Amino acid sequence: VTDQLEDLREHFKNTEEGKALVHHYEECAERVKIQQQQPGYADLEHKEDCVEEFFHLQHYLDTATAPRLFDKLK
Amino acid sequence: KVEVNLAAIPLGKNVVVKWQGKPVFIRHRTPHEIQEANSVDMSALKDPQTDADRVKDPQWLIMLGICTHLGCVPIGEAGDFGGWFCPCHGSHYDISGRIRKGPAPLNLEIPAYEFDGDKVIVG
Amino acid sequence: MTAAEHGLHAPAYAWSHNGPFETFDHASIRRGYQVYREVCAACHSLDRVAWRTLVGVSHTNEEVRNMAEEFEYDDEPDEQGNPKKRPGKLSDYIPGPYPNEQAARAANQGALPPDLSLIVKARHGGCDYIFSLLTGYPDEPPAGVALPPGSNYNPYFPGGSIAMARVLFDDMVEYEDGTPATTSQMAKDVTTFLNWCAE
Amino acid sequence: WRTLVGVSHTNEEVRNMAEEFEYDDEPDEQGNPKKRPGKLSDYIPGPYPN
Amino acid sequence: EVKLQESGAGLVQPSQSLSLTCSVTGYSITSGYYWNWIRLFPGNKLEWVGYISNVGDNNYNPSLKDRLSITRDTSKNQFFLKLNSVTTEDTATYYCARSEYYSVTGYAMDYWGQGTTVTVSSAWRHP
Amino acid sequence: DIELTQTPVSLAASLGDRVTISCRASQDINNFLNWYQQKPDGTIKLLIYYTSRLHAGVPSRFSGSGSGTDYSLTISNLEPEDIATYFCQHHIKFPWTFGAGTKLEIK
Amino acid sequence: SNIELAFSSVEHIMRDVHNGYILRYLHANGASFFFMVMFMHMAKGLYYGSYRSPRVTLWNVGVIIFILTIATAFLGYCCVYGQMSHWGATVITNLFSAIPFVGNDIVSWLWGGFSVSNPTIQRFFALHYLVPFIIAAMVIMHLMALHIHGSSNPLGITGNLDRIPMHSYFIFKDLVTVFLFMLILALFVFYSPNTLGHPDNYIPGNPLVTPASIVPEWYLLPFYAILRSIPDKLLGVITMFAAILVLLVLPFTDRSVVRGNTFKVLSKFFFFIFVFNFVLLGQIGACHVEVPYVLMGQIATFIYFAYFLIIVPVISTIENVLFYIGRVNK
Ligand code: HEM
Ligand code: HEM
Ligand SMILES: O=C1C(O)=C([C@H]2CC[C@H](c3ccc(Cl)cc3)CC2)C(=O)c2ccccc21
Ligand code: FES
Structure with a gap:
């Protein structure tokens, strides 16, 4: 059994706005790598991260992975 | 009187312990952090005090986690001063445990303590 | 407040009991107890719930008498003045995994696993937030978030750094009735069971 | 024990008596018992365990 | 941050007075710790000159005690050298520094001036 | 006036390896010994206080130690450029006293 | 009211006592409705300018009542001994330090020891018993003042030309607001019992760790x-x-x-x-x-x-x- 939720999160990541938003994070996840190889990074002090992205994604997921999810369940 | 295992405290770890019904704060201070504390303007300060008086060895910050406003217990590694924030009425404390922003009139109190081996007797 | 310190808002799943006319799903509660027994009991006390209280809700009189006696509570001293054990009675409170606060932390990198009996009320969102923290352990701590040694990431916890590692991994519980022992079905139940426990 | 001090004895005199007995004490870091001598803060222990 | 800024005549004619000044910013002369003078000799060796404290008590070196006068202006957050009767023997780069004090770790100069080089000489310069 | 033996009298080293200056007091100084650092442009910094303890910023690869009357200053690798003359002072009493130094160039 | 049994005993009232949960949700939700209704009562007094002579004393006394009701409900909160309780009780005790000189001692006294400890929750229970009778005592003088001048009107002119007797009009009028009051209170009590409380309070109070x-x-x-x-x-x-x-x-x-x-x-x-x-x-x-x-x-x-x-x-x-x-x- 493909997890009733995992499966539902998947299907929604792969709609229009899912694509649009998984990307937005990737663009950021890449940008992070780039900033990390650099010298004296550990003393950059204001190091970017992509939690703000991440959360914008789950919100889109949640908003759909919630009123739907529960009927797949027992 | 109580006694802490100083070795069991990583460099940059906040440790709380039960003494006299209050909490006692012990941070293991990094040298960058030690510098922040002692490189500051005692006129930008409400209850102005030299970090080196507040501490015996600068590597060890040791104080009663009672917010000198109306006596809550400040959240660690918090605030706008690399110290502590008190969620009760927003008093901000710095990395030497002293008052920067907020209603608190005073710097987080320093208990009596003696070092001994790596055991500090907080009484 | 940064959305990272707050934790992400758990969504409005549609529970069996939500609504003014809705009894719990007792079948669901029954499952959660197993999901409770096999999984989280390893670490978590449920001290304000008594064996008898299960009877008529999730189980039947013996069904709970059985569970009850699988544990040796303390019992009044013999004629000499020396201890003794004894099995449980229905009159008892489901024993914690640990003998005190310390061994609870020793067994968890110095974390104090919350007694669960009251969890669905001692948290905002509650049923949802319980479900979501349990089905919301994502694979990796988001680009840039640097996680301490022995701590996991969760968007639904505040500041993600949760001292509880993920614990739902499909099928690790053998659902006695015979339901998809998933993780979003292992979870939805212990939530409905933990709901009961606090209310 | 303390209640004796100043009445029948002197501070140490009662500190002495006090510590001749091992009261229960909060568990170590592992979660296992321990004894400890008494303090003046204590109540003079009964001969029997129950 | 804290910063120390040297300023003064570094070309003094013998039998006169060497007179430097160390202006600070990012901490105060009258909070805490110690306010020092230290000279770096031609032969690349360092010597402690003296100090004024945070409440202005003068621990001088006794090699130079009969000859100097550390002081301060508190309105201006700065401390002063005045080495009387200068000989070429005194020719060296000069450094101001703040020295902390702890009970445990004792003293340490952790904030140093940028340097001001003096040369005792009877040469003439346009004032 | 407690005098300190700086040694070796400035010995250079190879680009990729360690080194270890040392101090030796004319008296018992009780770990009250700091280590300083003079980059050729003149600037002098703090590196080590109370025999063994880093100052803010000085990279963890710096070490230093000692006790009684004899003290070290062990570096880990001389890259990228630790090129400076490393003085040492006692502060057990007054007046305090630096060493000779120990200039550090490439071999 | 012992600091150990305290938090649990309320759970006891919840899990065990027959209709005990109804006892709690009513006590607690009710305290709120008390406070709403009291604000609306105090509102009404501002808007129609009841506070205004000859009704000053009438007014003033209600200010005393309002004070005693805050004092009362606070203590009743400190008696659950959850998180919000132990820290609530710390700050209010600490308002007294603000008093020059003696202020800390007052607080120490008032605590009966080093911290909001056991001699504290126990006095907070006892004072919680006492005070509501003081409110009732005071409600009587409040009603006495009300009585010698009688109620005002949504016209702020003299009543003395067209009076009618409280029985049976207002007795019946008052019965309408009453039932309505109980209805919303029923609504909360059975359906939304904590839509008005802070979840931090189902957590046993802990003197080392304030929440955030x-x-x-x-x-x-x-x-x-x-x-x-x-x-x-x-x-x-x-x-x-x-x-x-x-x-x-x-x-x-x-x-x-x-x-x-x-x-x-x-x-x-x-x-x-x-x-x-x-x-x-x-x-x-x-x-x-x-x-x-x-x-x-x-x-x-x-x-x-x-x-x-x-x-x-x-x-x-x-x-x-x-x-x-x-x-x-x-
Ligand atoms: C149905 C299964 C389980 C559930 C629902 C559950 C639930 C929870 C909850 C609600 C918290 C509270 C954190 C918060 O909300 O602030 C928590 C924390 C914790 N849990 Fe679990 N748990 C389960 C299983 C386990 C297991 C199997 C272990 C270890 C073997 C464990 C160890 C811990 C520890 C050490 C903490 C402390 C985390 C902290 O202090 O932030 N739990 N758990
Ligand atoms: C235990 C709380 C209280 C009780 C039992 C109470 C009772 C009453 C009653 C029965 C009346 C007559 C009906 C009415 O006019 O509403 C009244 C009116 C009045 N109350 Fe109260 N009250 C309370 C709180 C207060 C407070 C807190 C204040 C002021 C701070 C206040 C000031 C007044 C005044 C000035 C009137 C006259 C209103 C008018 O002219 O119509 N009362 N109160
Ligand atoms: O820090 C506070 C705090 O300051 C209050 C406040 C609320 C208003 C109280 C109050 C006291 C007296 C009057 Cl006449 C009015 C309000 C004063 C304490 C709390 O109720 C509280 C509750 C739980 C945790 C922390 C706190
Ligand atoms: S108690 Fe810390 S701010 Fe008021």
């Missing part, structure tokens, strides 16, 4: 706000208490010549700024000491006291003069 969401009771919030608004300890305390006392000047600063905002446009208007400020002030209490919230908090607080002390006597004096020139010849 310190929202206090709603009916209390607007004061929490005012308290916080002041970056000074002594002054902040004073200003919190002053937020309630100031209510006693209201019969002097009302400069008008008529009792009642009813025929009073400029008065109505600010009266609802006052209401609405007061609610905002409350919203400010819930949010973190973040920006612009602090500065918003500060401005409301100003608006608050300014309404009694400034707006009202001003407006009402103006409003006298509009009433003159707005008719007469010369």
Whole structure:
């Protein structure tokens, strides 16, 4: 059994706005790598991260992975 | 009187312990952090005090986690001063445990303590 | 407040009991107890719930008498003045995994696993937030978030750094009735069971 | 024990008596018992365990 | 941050007075710790000159005690050298520094001036 | 006036390896010994206080130690450029006293 | 009321005592409705200018009652001994340090030891028993004042020309609000029992660890706000208490010549700024000491006291003069 939720999160990541938003994070996840190889990074002090992205994604997921999810369940 | 295992405290770890019904704060201070504390303007300060008086060895910050406003217990590694924030009425404390922003009139109190081996007797 | 310190808002799943006319799903509660027994009991006390209280809700009189006696509570001293054990009675409170606060932390990198009996009320969102923290352990701590040694990431916890590692991994519980022992079905139940426990 | 001090004895005199007995004490870091001598803060222990 | 800024005549004619000044910013002369003078000799060796404290008590070196006068202006957050009767023997780069004090770790100069080089000489310069 | 033996009298080293200056007091100084650092442009910094303890910023690869009357200053690798003359002072009493130094160039 | 059994015993009342959960949810939700209804009662007194002679003493006493009801409900909270309880009880005990010199000792006394400990929850239980009889004692003088002058009217003119007897009109009228009251209270009690409480309170109090969401009771919030608004300890305390006392000047600063905002446009208007400020002030209490919230908090607080002390006597004096020139010849 493909997890009733995992499966539902998947299907929604792969709609229009899912694509649009998984990307937005990737663009950021890449940008992070780039900033990390650099010298004296550990003393950059204001190091970017992509939690703000991440959360914008789950919100889109949640908003759909919630009123739907529960009927797949027992 | 109580006694802490100083070795069991990583460099940059906040440790709380039960003494006299209050909490006692012990941070293991990094040298960058030690510098922040002692490189500051005692006129930008409400209850102005030299970090080196507040501490015996600068590597060890040791104080009663009672917010000198109306006596809550400040959240660690918090605030706008690399110290502590008190969620009760927003008093901000710095990395030497002293008052920067907020209603608190005073710097987080320093208990009596003696070092001994790596055991500090907080009484 | 940064959305990272707050934790992400758990969504409005549609529970069996939500609504003014809705009894719990007792079948669901029954499952959660197993999901409770096999999984989280390893670490978590449920001290304000008594064996008898299960009877008529999730189980039947013996069904709970059985569970009850699988544990040796303390019992009044013999004629000499020396201890003794004894099995449980229905009159008892489901024993914690640990003998005190310390061994609870020793067994968890110095974390104090919350007694669960009251969890669905001692948290905002509650049923949802319980479900979501349990089905919301994502694979990796988001680009840039640097996680301490022995701590996991969760968007639904505040500041993600949760001292509880993920614990739902499909099928690790053998659902006695015979339901998809998933993780979003292992979870939805212990939530409905933990709901009961606090209310 | 303390209640004796100043009445029948002197501070140490009662500190002495006090510590001749091992009261229960909060568990170590592992979660296992321990004894400890008494303090003046204590109540003079009964001969029997129950 | 804290910063120390040297300023003064570094070309003094013998039998006169060497007179430097160390202006600070990012901490105060009258909070805490110690306010020092230290000279770096031609032969690349360092010597402690003296100090004024945070409440202005003068621990001088006794090699130079009969000859100097550390002081301060508190309105201006700065401390002063005045080495009387200068000989070429005194020719060296000069450094101001703040020295902390702890009970445990004792003293340490952790904030140093940028340097001001003096040369005792009877040469003439346009004032 | 407690005098300190700086040694070796400035010995250079190879680009990729360690080194270890040392101090030796004319008296018992009780770990009250700091280590300083003079980059050729003149600037002098703090590196080590109370025999063994880093100052803010000085990279963890710096070490230093000692006790009684004899003290070290062990570096880990001389890259990228630790090129400076490393003085040492006692502060057990007054007046305090630096060493000779120990200039550090490439071999 | 022992600090151990305390938190549990309430769970006991919840899990075990027959109808005990109904006992708790009613006690607690009820305390809230008490406070709503009391604000609406105090509202009504502002709007129609009840506080106004001959009813001053009537008014004043209600200010004493309102004080005793906050004192009462606070203690009843400290008796659950959850998280919000132990820290609530720390701060209120600590308001007394604000008192010059002796202040710390008062607090120590008042604590019966080093911290909000056991001799504390036990006295907080005992004082919780005592005080409600004091309110009732006081409700009697309050009703005595009410009695010798009788109620006012939504017209702020004299009653003495068209009186009718409380039985059976108002007895029956009052019965309508009563049932309605119970209905909403039933609604909360059975369906929304904690839609009014803070989840931090199902957590056993812990003296070493304050939470990081310190929202206090709603009916209390607007004061929490005012308290916080002041970056000074002594002054902040004073200003919190002053937020309630100031209510006693209201019969002097009302400069008008008529009792009642009813025929009073400029008065109505600010009266609802006052209401609405007061609610905002409350919203400010819930949010973190973040920006612009602090500065918003500060401005409301100003608006608050300014309404009694400034707006009202001003407006009402103006409003006298509009009433003159707005008719007469010369
Ligand atoms: C149905 C299964 C389980 C559930 C629903 C559950 C639930 C929870 C909850 C609600 C918290 C509270 C954190 C918060 O909300 O602030 C928590 C924390 C914790 N849990 Fe679990 N748990 C489960 C299983 C386990 C297991 C199997 C272990 C270890 C073997 C464990 C160890 C811990 C520890 C050490 C903490 C402390 C985390 C902290 O202090 O932030 N739990 N758990
Ligand atoms: C235990 C709390 C209280 C009780 C039992 C109570 C009772 C009453 C009753 C029965 C009346 C007559 C019905 C009515 O006019 O509403 C009244 C009116 C009044 N109350 Fe109270 N009250 C309480 C709180 C307060 C407070 C807190 C205040 C002021 C701070 C206050 C001031 C007044 C005034 C001035 C009137 C006259 C209203 C008018 O002229 O119509 N009361 N109260
Ligand atoms: O820090 C506070 C705090 O300051 C109050 C406040 C609320 C208003 C109280 C109040 C006392 C007296 C009066 Cl007349 C009015 C309000 C004062 C304490 C709380 O209720 C509280 C509750 C739980 C945790 C922390 C806190
Ligand atoms: S108690 Fe810390 S801010 Fe008021």
